[PDB]
Amino acid sequence: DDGENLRPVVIDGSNVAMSHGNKEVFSCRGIKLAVDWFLERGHKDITVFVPAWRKEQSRPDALITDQEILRKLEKEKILVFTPSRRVQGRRVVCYDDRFIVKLAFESDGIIVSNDNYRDLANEKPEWKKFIDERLLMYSFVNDKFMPPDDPLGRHGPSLDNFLRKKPIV
């Protein structure tokens, strides 16, 4: 009764925020737009990973817009901050790519990102296979989040079936 035939969705928050932000600004609205696109379809299991330091105030070398969105998505049990802290004045950021891939793999889900995570794929063959079969790339056209209807190409599933556990034929 609550989207149990839908795959868990794991979103690369930084990838999406930078993409909506035209690669120069961390645009939190982009994360909201991606999230909302899945909610509108009945997805209940959605996780967005973002490094903790993105909570810090906007600065010239790390511009960010609509930052309050992050706390709101966290309050909705959708966004999860991954670890970061300063050590000897240097920001040390745990690799969130690893959180993204591990969570999607272990929950048998889908990854929303334009990043192909080749370093991680080259680390473990089961992850390479998984990323090959479960990556959902996308385009933004202004505020319009547009995933492809043919996410794995001409010989792959429809987008509708790609997001289901059991496909509909």
From Swiss-Prot:
Disulfide bonds: none annotated. It comes from the Eukaryota. Induction: By bacterial lipopolysaccharides (LPS) in macrophage cell line RAW 264.7. Residues 6-161 form the RNase NYN domain. Belongs to the ZC3H12 family. May function as RNase and regulate the levels of target RNA species. This is Probable ribonuclease ZC3H12C. It comes from Mus musculus. The gene is Zc3h12c. The chain holds residues 241 to 409 of 884 of the full protein.
